[PDB]
A paper describes a structure:
Central to the replication cycle of influenza viruses is the viral RNA-dependent RNA polymerase which transcribes and replicates the viral RNA genome. The influenza virus RNA-dependent RNA polymerase is a heterotrimeric multifunctional machine composed of polymerase basic 1 (PB1), polymerase basic 2 (PB2) and polymerase acidic (PA) subunits, that catalyzes both primer-independent replication (vRNA to complementary RNA (cRNA) and cRNA to vRNA synthesis) and primer-dependent transcription (vRNA to mRNA synthesis) in the nucleus of infected cells. PB1 houses the polymerase active site, whereas PB2 and PA contain, respectively, cap-binding and endonuclease domains required for transcription initiation by cap-snatching. These structures have revealed that the polymerase is a highly flexible macromolecule that can assume a variety of distinct conformations, enabling the polymerase to perform both transcription and replication that require different initiation and termination mechanisms.
Using cryo-EM we determined the structure of 17 polymerase-nanobody complexes at resolutions between 4.5 and 6.7 Å; this is sufficient resolution to accurately position each nanobody bound to the polymerase heterotrimer. Nb8191 binds to the PB1 N-terminus and PA residues 405–420, 531–534, 551–557, and 624–626 (site 4c). In addition to the core of the polymerase which was resolved in all structures, the PA endonuclease was resolved in the majority of structures (excluding Nb8189, Nb8190, Nb8192, Nb8196, Nb8202), while the C-terminal domains of PB2 remained unresolved in all structures.
Numbering used by the authors:
A (entry chain A): 1 to 716
B (entry chain F): 2 to 25, 32 to 51, 58 to 98, 112 to 121
C (entry chain B): 1 to 185, 207 to 756
D (entry chain C): 1 to 249
Amino acid sequence: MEDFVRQCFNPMIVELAEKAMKEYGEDLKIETNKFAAICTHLEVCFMYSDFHFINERGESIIVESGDPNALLKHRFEIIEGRDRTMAWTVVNSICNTTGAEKPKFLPDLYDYKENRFIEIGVTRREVHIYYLEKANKIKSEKTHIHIFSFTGEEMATKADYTLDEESRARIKTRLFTIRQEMASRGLWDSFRQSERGEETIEERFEITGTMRRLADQSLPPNFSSLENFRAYVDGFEPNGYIEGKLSQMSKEVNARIEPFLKTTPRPLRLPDGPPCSQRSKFLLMDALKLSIEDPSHEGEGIPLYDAIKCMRTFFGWKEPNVVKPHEKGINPNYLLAWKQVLAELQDIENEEKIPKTKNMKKTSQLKWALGENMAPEKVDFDDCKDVSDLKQYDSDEPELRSLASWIQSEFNKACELTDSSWIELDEIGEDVAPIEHIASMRRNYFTAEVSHCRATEYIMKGVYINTALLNASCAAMDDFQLIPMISKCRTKEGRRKTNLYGFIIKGRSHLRNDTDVVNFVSMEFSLTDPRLEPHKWEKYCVLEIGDMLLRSAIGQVSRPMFLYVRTNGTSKIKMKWGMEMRRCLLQSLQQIESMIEAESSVKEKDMTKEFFENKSETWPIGESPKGVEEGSIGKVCRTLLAKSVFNSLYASPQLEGFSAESRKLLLIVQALRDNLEPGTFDLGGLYEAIEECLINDPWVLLNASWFNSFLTHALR
Amino acid sequence: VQLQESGGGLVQAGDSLRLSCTTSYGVGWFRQAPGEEREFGASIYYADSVKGRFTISRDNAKNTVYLQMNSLKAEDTAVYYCAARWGQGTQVTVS
Amino acid sequence: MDVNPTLLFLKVPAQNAISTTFPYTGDPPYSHGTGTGYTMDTVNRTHQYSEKGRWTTNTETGAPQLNPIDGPLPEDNEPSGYAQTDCVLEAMAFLEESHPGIFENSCLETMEVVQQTRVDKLTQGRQTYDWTLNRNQPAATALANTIEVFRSNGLTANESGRLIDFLKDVMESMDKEEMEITTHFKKKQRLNKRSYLIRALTLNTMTKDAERGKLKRRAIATPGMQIRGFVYFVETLARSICEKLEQSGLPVGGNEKKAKLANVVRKMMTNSQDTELSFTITGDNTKWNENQNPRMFLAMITYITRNQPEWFRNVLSIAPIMFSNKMARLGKGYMFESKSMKLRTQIPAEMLASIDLKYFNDSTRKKIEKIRPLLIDGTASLSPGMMMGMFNMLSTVLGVSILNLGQKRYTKTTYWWDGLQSSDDFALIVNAPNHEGIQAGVDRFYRTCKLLGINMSKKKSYINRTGTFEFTSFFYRYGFVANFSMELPSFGVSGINESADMSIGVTVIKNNMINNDLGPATAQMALQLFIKDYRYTYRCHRGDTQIQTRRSFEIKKLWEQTRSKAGLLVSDGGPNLYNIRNLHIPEVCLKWELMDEDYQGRLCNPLNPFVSHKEIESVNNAVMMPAHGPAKNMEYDAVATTHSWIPKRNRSILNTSQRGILEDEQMYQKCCNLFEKFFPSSSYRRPVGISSMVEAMVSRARIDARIDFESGRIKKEEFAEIMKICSTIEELRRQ
Amino acid sequence: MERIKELRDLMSQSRTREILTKTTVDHMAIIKKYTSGRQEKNPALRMKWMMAMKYPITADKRIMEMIPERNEQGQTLWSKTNDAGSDRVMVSPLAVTWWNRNGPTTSAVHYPKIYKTYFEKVERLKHGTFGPVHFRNQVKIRRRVDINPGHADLSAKEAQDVIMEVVFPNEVGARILTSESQLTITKEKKEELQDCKISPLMVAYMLERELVRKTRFLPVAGGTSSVYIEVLHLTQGTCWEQMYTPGGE
RNA sequence: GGCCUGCU
RNA sequence: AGUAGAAACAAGGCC
């Protein structure tokens, strides 16, 4: 039958009908009479629509061939011959522009004169039944319907026929051409009734070929095919198989509970080796401040001018000389770098306006100090294979180092009060609710407690230094840059003040990965002689740069004044995390506020004021040789703030591992102290897990010592 | 933790002496000469000036730390204090 | 006096101050170089936990595979992957018996979803291993490349737009003699059957960074695109199953987890009378993923899909069949340094099979020596067990089956147990009349776990009396206690854009106040610090200050120009009006009534060249990877302002041979923008159909010109011009 | 006119012609998401790192013809170098602030009508009345509650057709909404937003947010009302309760 | 010396 | 040298 559509109809219509065939997903080889019927429907749609044009009037202009002009409007514009999505697109667009009613089924054409749709259907059966059939299929329709049938008859409601009658003679001539051409073909044994509305399909997902063999190799050891295994599974029913293997399984497979008593836990062993060194990016306990007493705010001002003005406030400069060498570098380079920094600072002082940011010369001194041109050149393996020295990067456990007493004192003095306010908080919306007033009062109390704390000063120092370093690295990637360490505080009298700890020289910072390292050299003034705790300054070079006179009742001290100079490095991640050190304030004060709220849930009243003023209640916050010492809530605030600050400063994988594996043991010990009969399956394994995190970090070793002290004081 | 030292006194040069410290933990023995501050002696490790001569030991059942000094020198002459991690000290005088 | 914070625990219980034990204020550990060492170590460890299995050689991939299932029962407490098929089938049968109709229903909804799912659902995924280039690429890019290759090779069933048809094409590709791929350096290369099989069965290994809570780094894996559809269907089934199990806690959030934990502890302890003792085990499973054999997941799913259409069973079984034969790419490689000659070199991992061992240290030398037998075409066969939690939900199903297997109806003894399982972590409440009963119950639970290939970490687990325990960093002490140290890293600027960062910060403060019991004063301090950091990050200072920045001049002139300066946004250098009462209001709407009409109009102008919206999914959704958890998405309330710009892209593609991808990106985006202008609903609802672009665009041009004349700007001259231009593009597409 | 003209210009060049011809409508989404740009793992780090560069943001090409290349002192506002995989050009953040002080102005009176949810929140809070804070232990129990206070009793899919018919009336397709509640919602949001020119996508997104019901599990103590849950952070705490009555009541 | 890139 | 820690950075590539 398909030979007929090969022969007669034009290409355009046959591929339109083929795409309509693909539309609903049925195959053309099984039933083709539908293809012919609907392609004839589509053909009558065209032949009825084309050759029919309109101009600004009604009364369509009919031309056998559209002449070249702007007057190519089509009388009837076709609906079908398009995908369902576009057919409904045209339906909705016509409804929204023509203000007509939206039909629920697919029309075939639209006309302007009568501003409505045409649903053309030419069926094998006579018209006077198919018409009202499709009419009762369509609900309350104003779209006019018109149908032909092979006998040659026409019909329509309203007795309406919308265009010329010679066109309809055309239609029925086409119709009988179709008819008495099948006459030569002979199809009416099924042509009248060949489609009955079949819609059914079964989804087929068959495993075959290579993928089947893979299925045959992904079974238990004693199975040969997926078919057999699935049959076995379907036939499988529970018949007490877990019990049999449990009985047969060796009894050494057990989870015996070892009781956890007061005498069970042993102190954590600390590693032994050379004392632990300093790792901070700046001096914490041995910092010195040169000040100007200016009225500018933290960010307000220009760095270089402030630094120069602060440094001019000090008199007593001496020619620098080596006091304590780096022990691994070239100290003369550090000396020359310091003198170069001074010289270029003067050079800025001379000229017209202090630059906002200064670049330094790339001398051999800072070329060595900043580690320039030291990365091995990257080459290909095929060119370097016979080199005996060629091997992997050194990948082994870090060097072992024992704890020293300097970190303990540094933390002790990091929780001490100061003679300045190191936090100038921002603005918030004016409090409107009583709860907001309570929150503001609490916040004011904590700010009064923590602002005068060395932890806040360290927070500001780190934030400013890391912000400046990151910005300089991102801006001046190539050229070495000078950045004075600046921090602005407020005195007890209320006068604002600036403080200059020293200088940082940032080097080449072409940082691609988050782990890539930018090297800088840090110089900081101090008065602490490095000849008393040399092991804490393994990586520092310390010079003697001047003498300071601070008013004291013992005449006047006239102390020496040294310069701690070192080469340090950071990374994008480290800079970003060090510039978010202000969340240590959060951590600490959230803990304290949780304490206050928990206690106030007992007594139905806010308990902040008496906690902060009466200072009756105290918490164990340290141990003295006499015994455990307790301090007021403010001291707890400062201690927790210092702990968070040191966590942010000495952060490392060792800290995370020890924190987790020691929190586990802390929970076990707490369960013991709560009389909850705690038990363990392998306590030695937990101990070994904790002890492997303690390698060389001073902070984690101090935490381990604190944990041992807590165990000793606990378990009683 | 209260601590009491015993076993000090006047001794000959090249003589011997067993200090003992009763307690109420790691322990240490430290000394103080008349003209000076504290000097490390032993812990339970010994200092350079006393190594080989002196031996530190403890009985955890008796709650006592001992310091067995031998082959004494006139430069051992000090108050020997016991410490837990301080005693009043026991006078040792070598001559 | 020496300060010691830990002594604070002598007065404050450990859980009431547990936040102090979370050093989440410093930089988390990161990996620096290759992850090849970790990948090799994981492969060797997975293969040696199942050493007593049986060896075979796949006839298709030619790789050695180790099957430990039904192997000898363990005789020691060391990890073991010798799961027994009959035991696990019985466990699943008991799970079904205790929950009748679970499998049949879940299979019904899964069948609905599979037969109505679309291909585009695969684009909604993070990095995936594209085999066309042998590298990780965004899910959409890899899917597009694979579809292009399939269409070039003759597999065009995916044009039906159905994920099931895409999987049919994927499987049909397995039986092809020779496929063709494209490489740029374009060159057409031919892949034989075995090479393509291994490229479709392989995984890409990387090192996990920003992982807090352990000293050592780990390795993670990413699968290809051929196997992700089957994984999607299997995980859909597993999620539908677990949603019907109250003992599971994987498909829920954190608060639901806490609620279920409280309910189970109350149920276990309350029902227990005075005579019965109760004990809670806070258990962690050692080597959870390395001991889960994909064959056992195949067994579980084929038991689940019993009495179901065979096509459903086949499509759900394809995934574990491929995992059982999965291969893993070793990784980036190894970098060597020579200090004598002062140079460095980078050898790819694919050379580990043949490269001499003189360059490697003892540990790496032994690892390579042990893993070499499993190396096939630069990748190692990893049949014995899963790599990194790809089947999280099925593992949770197995754990829930174990938990339910002790409902006192199967224990047949006075003791019994229950609890909650979330993959790699569990809380087990066991009750028994005496300590001997508790010991026997825990011993039998451990033994049954060892029969299913699941191991309990004795070093990271402990048992106490009920009332105090831990679960996924949630510490329960007669009621869950807030931590607030897990969410600390999320208190900074997110890094999306100005308005997005502001809204996300305020919303995070609000949420942590609601859930994590953040205090009022602490919340105010957090708001102040966040505002400070926000102003210092975006160079948007109050405007009345003299802080010179790269943006302080325009901000200051805008400040001096504005009359009601209280309406200026913090992004434009205005005062901050936020407070505890205003944390749930966008900044634009909070300052709407205070803004000057000129500034208000300039700010919220639709014609601004900065705002760009791509799809309904990416309107106000921000992907923030939370600390100690999987990547998560958040809805943030924000008004589309001129500050909603999107930041610069990487721009490093210009120096790579894969430079033509940018031209293809630009052309695809131009075509997509044209289509959207032709089809405005393209973004909100993704268009569907089987026609091509130009057909729809030209035909809609026809119709829209028509109707927009029937009322609108068009004129006959223009309408006819459009009609004949449509004809022109038609004849152009003809040729 | 224009649209078909850039269509013809695209089809003029062979590569785009092939892309338009061979690519089917269904693959629309795929190729639209086809990109070499990886999703950032650490957005904060790079946002703090990119903002230190010059020209850190991106904007459409049209910015080159509305904003001058430099400001009064000569600080550059935009660059002509396009982004990696787009025709957009990289520009400095000042071009934002500049647009807010001398850029074109419009009538933003209809934004309150569009962003109905946020402005309703503001109005509800502005007329709220606070009360005394009572300090007592709060038994926070976890419950499933609806957060959206303006949901019109419609699901996502249920209101998606409404949203399309309100914004994209022609792409609705087969669906014609039956429920009369949807009829009235369509009428109201059609006549209200008849000429709003913000964007079809944002209008659809905000209509989805407003009409679609959404639910989440939260620890609550009292309240349980939709209006009382949006301020759950302000009314309920660990040991304090703040009586509050939104402006709606 | 000149120019390109900074998660590809 | 320095940062850092089971492998890396201490710029890369292209002419």
